[PDB]
Structures are given as C-alpha cells and as structure tokens.
Amino acid sequence: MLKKKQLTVLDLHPGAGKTRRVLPEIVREAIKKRLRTVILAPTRVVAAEMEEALRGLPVRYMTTAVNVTHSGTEIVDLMCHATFTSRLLQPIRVPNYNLNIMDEAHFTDPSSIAARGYISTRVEMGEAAAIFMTATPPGTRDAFPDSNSPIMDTEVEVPERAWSSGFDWVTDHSGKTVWFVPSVRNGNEIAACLTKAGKRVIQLSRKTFETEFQKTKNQEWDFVITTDISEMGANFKADRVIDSRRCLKPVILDGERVILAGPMPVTHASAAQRRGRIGRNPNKPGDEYMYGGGCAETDEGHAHWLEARMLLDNIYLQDGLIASLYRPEADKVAAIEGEFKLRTEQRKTFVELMKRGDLPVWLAYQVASAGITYTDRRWCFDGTTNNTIMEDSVPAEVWTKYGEKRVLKPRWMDARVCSDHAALKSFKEFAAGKR
Ligand SMILES: Cc1cc(F)cc(S(N)(=O)=O)c1
Numbered sequence: 332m333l334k335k336k337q338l339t340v341l342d343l344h345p346g347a348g349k350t351r352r353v354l355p356e357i358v359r360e361a362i363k364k365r366l367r368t369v370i371l372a373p374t375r376v377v378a379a380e381m382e383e384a385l386r387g388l389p390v391r392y393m394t395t396a397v398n399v400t401h402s403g404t405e406i407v408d409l410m411c412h413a414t415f416t417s418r419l420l421q422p423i424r425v426p427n428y429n430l431n432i433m434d435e436a437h438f439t440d441p442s443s444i445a446a447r448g449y450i451s452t453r454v455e456m457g458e459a460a461a462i463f464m465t466a467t468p469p470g471t472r473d474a475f476p477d478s479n480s481p482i483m484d485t486e487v488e489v490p491e492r493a494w495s496s497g498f499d500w501v502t503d504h505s506g507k508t509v510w511f512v513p514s515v516r517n518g519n520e521i522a523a524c525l526t527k528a529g530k531r532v533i534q535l536s537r538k539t540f541e542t543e544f545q546k547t548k549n550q551e552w553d554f555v556i557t558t559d560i561s562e563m564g565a566n567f568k569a570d571r572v573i574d575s576r577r578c579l580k581p582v583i584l585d586g587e588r589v590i591l592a593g594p595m596p597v598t599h600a601s602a603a604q605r606r607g608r609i610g611r612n613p614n615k616p617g618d619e620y621m622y623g624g625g626c627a628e629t630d631e632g633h634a635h636w637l638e639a640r641m642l643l644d645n646i647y648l649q650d651g652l653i654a655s656l657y658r659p660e661a662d663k664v665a666a667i668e669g670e671f672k673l674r675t676e677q678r679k680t681f682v683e684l685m686k687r688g689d690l691p692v693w694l695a696y697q698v699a700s701a702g703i704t705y706t707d708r709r710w711c712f713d714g715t716t717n718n719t720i721m722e723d724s725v726p727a728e729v730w731t732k733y734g735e736k737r738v739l740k741p742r743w744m745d746a747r748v749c750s751d752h753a754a755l756k757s758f759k760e761f762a763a764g765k766r
Pocket residue numbers: 362365389404405406407
C-alpha cells in the first residue's frame with residue numbers, strides 16, 4: 332500500500348477491523364519507512380477512538396478532542412477531514428504528506444469530498460500514496476454487505492411522523508434501536524412520540540454529535556434518533572437499526588438558491604453504513620435491520636459535490652493547477668475546474684464566511700464572489716420578499732448591528748441556514764453581526 336503513486340481502497344466490510352486492527356499496522360509500517368503521514372478522522376468522536384486504537388504510537392493529535400502532550404518525535408499527524416481541508420484553504424503550511432490515510436472515506440460532506448480530491452490528485456501526480464478506508468466506496472451498489480454476525484433484514488413501512496397505532500413492532504422491542512431519520516425536525520417528532528410511550532431517547536445531529544454521543548455511553552437508552560451523521564463510524568451497543576432509508580438533498584436551483592429537496596431515498600453506501608451499525612458482534616447474533624424504502628443515487632446533482640469544487644478551486648496545488656474530484660465521484664456535478672477560483676481578497680472572505688461565519692460553502696461563495704467583505708451583513712436584509720426567513724409561520728426578525736429591527740431576507744437563500752431552530756438561531760446571530 333505504502334509505495335508512492337498508489338491509491339488503495341481498503342473496502343473490508345463494516346466491523347472488519349479497519350480502524351482498530353489495520354490502521355495501527357499501517358502506522359507502524361509508515362513509521363518504519365519514514366513516511367510523513369496524515370490520518371483523517373470524519374469526527375472528533377472517531378479521532379478519540381483512533382487515539383485509543385493507536386495509544387502509545389507516536390501520533391500528533393491535531394484536535395482538542397484528545398488531551399495528549401505531543402513529544403515533537405511524531406511524523407504521523409491525526410486531524411479531522413474538515414481540519415485538513417480548512418488548513419489547505421488557510422494561509423498556513425500543510426506538510427506534503429507522503430502517505431494520506433482517510434478513515435470513513437465515504438463521508439459526502441463538502442470538506443471530505445474536497446480532501447479526497449486534493450489527495451487523489453497528489454497521488455495521480457506521482458507525489459504521494461493514499462489509503463481510503465471504507466466498506467462503501469463511491470458508486471457501491473450493495474446495501475447489504477457482509478457483517479460480523481448474521482443480520483435479519485426486513486422491508487417494512489417505517490413511521491416518519493408521530494403514530495397512535497399500526498407500528499406495534501417499533502415499541503414492543505426490549506433492546507436498543509438506532510433509528511435513522513431524514514432530518515433533525517423529523518427526528519424531533521419521532522423522539523417526542525417515543526418519549527410519550529415511555530422510551531428513553533437520545534437525538535444525534537451534526538451540530539450536537541460530540542456532546543450527545545457521550546450520552547449513549549454514560550446513560551441507559553432505548554432509542555438513538557440520528558440523522559445520516561451516524562453513518563461515519565459512530566458505534567452503538569445496539570441490537571436493531573430502524574432505517575427510514577431517506578435523507579434531505581441540498582439542490583442549487585438556477586444557480587440562485589439552495590433548497591433541501593426530499594426527503595428522498597439514501598444511496599446504497601448510506602443504506603449499507605446505516606445497516607452496518609448492527610451485526611458487528613459475532614457473539615451477539617439476531618441483530619435486526621428494518622428498512623422503509625429503496626435506495627437511489629441521490630448524490631447525483633447533490634450540492635455537496637459542487638461545493639467541493641468551490642473548495643478545491645480555492646486550494647493552491649502547483650502554479651495555476653487545480654485538484655480534480657476523486658475519479659469515481661467526479662461526475663456527480665456539472666462543474667468546470669477553476670470556474671469558482673477567487674482573487675486573493677475575495678478568497679480570504681470566502682474562507683472566513685465558512686470558518687468564522689459558519690455559512691454553507693455555496694452561500695459563502697455567493698457573498699465573497701459578490702465582493703462583500705466578511706463583516707458587511709447588509710445582504711442578510713436586502714433580498715426579495717420570497718427570500719423572507721420564517722420563524723413559527725412569522726418573518727424572523729433581528730436587531731441589526733445598527734440597532735434597527737429588520738426582517739431576515741437574505742439576498743441569497745440557502746435552506747441550510749434555517750433547516751432547524753439551532754441553524755436559524757446561528758444565522759440570526761450572524762445577520763446581527765454577533766460573529
Ligand atoms: C523517522 C523517524 C525517526 C525517529 F528517530 C523516530 C520516529 S518515530 N517517533 O515515529 O518513532 C520516526
């Protein structure tokens with residue numbers, strides 16, 4: 332695996348030991364070969380699990396998720412997928428790693444897609460080796476891969492709303508259930524219904540993941556209600572997955588706005604990762620996977636691949652050269668390399684709108700490309716009437732940095748800034764000049 336110009340896909344089935352058994356072996360071999368190496372974890376949770384699997388090996392943990400004194404003897408760095416892409420975009424020297432290891436390399440967040448593009452381009456150039464670790468590489472068509480123990484697979488109608496009757500099998504269960512829902516708001520309704528029926532429910536989303544995930548270990552629970560983020564190497568001591576088989580798809584309409592389309596079917600890779608949360612213990616057979624719909628290739632036309640192009644267009648590679656998407660996922664977007672490349676000051680603004688502003692890539696790009704500076708929030712208020720953001724069926728209002736109460740009416744509407752209460756709250760603070 333560790334010869335230059337090689338990109339290896341380690342596609343052992345879920346629970347095969349990629350992270351706990353194979354990764355320490357690769358790290359020892361890289362150290363023996365003097366390979367400057369980066370290990371990319373999808374989440375701070377996985378970063379912490381990796382420290383446990385690697386404990387004692389000289390690894391520099393570039394994450395506050397791990398509390399370790401680094402010796403300065405390390406040639407192996409560990410950071411999150413997003414941190415790698417972030418450091419590439421920022422005016423900061425990222426070492427030219429001889430060996431690039433991405434764990435949970437199926438992650439379809441823009442920063443992970445961008446990281447795979449940059450690394451795969453360095454490998455194609457003959458500059459580096461890479462190992463992508465995932466049971467479900469891009470374009471996988473198998474929703475039912477092998478597991479450590481036999482899984483009971485059942486196609487069943489799964490509730491997406493509160494229910495009074497017709498789903499006795501959901502609550503009649505005495506074990507632990509991980510339940511994949513298409514959105515935070517859909518999970519809130521299911522979580523409330525289950526809590527009302529006497530169930531202990533933990534809710535996971537991207538925004539709450541590190542904090543809430545700890546509850547799965549620190550307290551007894553009956554249900555975890557999670558969005559697609561629990562597809563990225565999150566492990567539970569569970570005996571059942573309920574899978575809606577649905578997700579939201581960010582879609583750019585007419586180059587002008589982003590909507591959250593759906594809910595609609597998950598990819599085969601997503602279905603296999605959801606299912607792959609169970610059947611992981613060879614000493615616990617009888618785990619169940621209940622699925623409520625088919626799969627489809629809903630990554631086609633998905634905004635994340637166009638956002639990944641926006642990020643890669645703004646990462647220095649060599650002179651005017653621009654990293655390509657990793658070949659197997661390079662047709663998911665109609666996009667030309669370099670079309671989103673920004674001039675120096677507009678690019679700094681784009682980075683800051685993402686890093687400090689916490690705006691989605693697409694929205695950060697619209698603001699920066701329009702020549703708006705980071706602290707200029709007039710655009711949050713000067714959009715058309717139909718860009719009005721609604722809060723409980725009434726226009727959302729904020730006090731501007733000027734002390735004026737105004738209707739939140741962004742020049743560019745991205746549904747992700749107001750997809751849930753937490754998102755809208757963060758966007759209100761942004762429109763108000765509070766970060
Ligand atoms: C290249 C190299 C030299 C060395 F003396 C020690 C290491 S380490 N800290 O990875 O074991 C690596």
